[PDB]
């Protein structure tokens, strides 16, 4: 039975797509069906900014952020809670989960 209309892959008109490797289990998966997450974080946590700020020669220096895109395999992500099973009627809600920070 057709689980999804878009086949849960999102190509529809390219025949084939270059595959990219998972960051957790190193699985090769097509880039479209690769459930990607941009992890923008600081080099230090919120519990360390104080010590670095008081141990800094520059008074107004703002610590820079680390950027990287994460390409998961699907199984690791279902395991690592970043992607969640849904009820059948709620599968089709394409919009990203509504921001809790309202």
């Amino acid at each position: 039975p057709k689980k999804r209309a878009s086949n849960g892959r999102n190509k529809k008109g390219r025949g084939h797509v270059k595959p990219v490797r998972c960051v957790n289990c190193s699985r090769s998966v097509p880039k479209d069906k690769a459930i990607k997450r941009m992890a923008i974080r600081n080099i230090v946590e919120a519990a360390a900014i104080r010590d670095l700020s008081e141990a800094s020669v520059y008074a107004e220096y703002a610590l820079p952020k680390t950027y990287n895109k994460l390409h998961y395999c699907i199984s690791c992500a279902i395991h690592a809670r970043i992607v969640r099973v849904r009820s059948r009627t709620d599968r089709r809600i394409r919009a990203p989960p509504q921001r809790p920070r309202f």
């Binding site: 230090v44 946590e45 520059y58 990287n68």
Partner: protein
Amino acid sequence: DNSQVFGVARIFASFNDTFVHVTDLSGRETIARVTGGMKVKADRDESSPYAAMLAAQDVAAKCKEVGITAVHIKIRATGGTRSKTPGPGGQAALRALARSGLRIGRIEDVTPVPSDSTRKKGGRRGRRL
């Protein structure tokens, strides 16, 4: 400027090891090469944040006895193909450098990132833990 003696921290943190290693501005010659895994024995906690913190305290003491006063932060991950994320211990290493007297400036990340250049360990189906 009160003539701070500047260096770079060159913190290298894998998931299995943490490297706190200060060197001069040029980076050619190496003041302190105490390793995070050195400070522990279990060999499973080489990258544990406590080990990095203790190695970092060792580095700070070595710097203050050498004459190093300020350090630039060089956080590094494994880079290449293995991973793109900082090691779990390097963060505590940076914290320990922070709260240890030495002055800090110019924190940045120097993770070597490839332009999708080579095959990655694991095969097609990858790790099957």
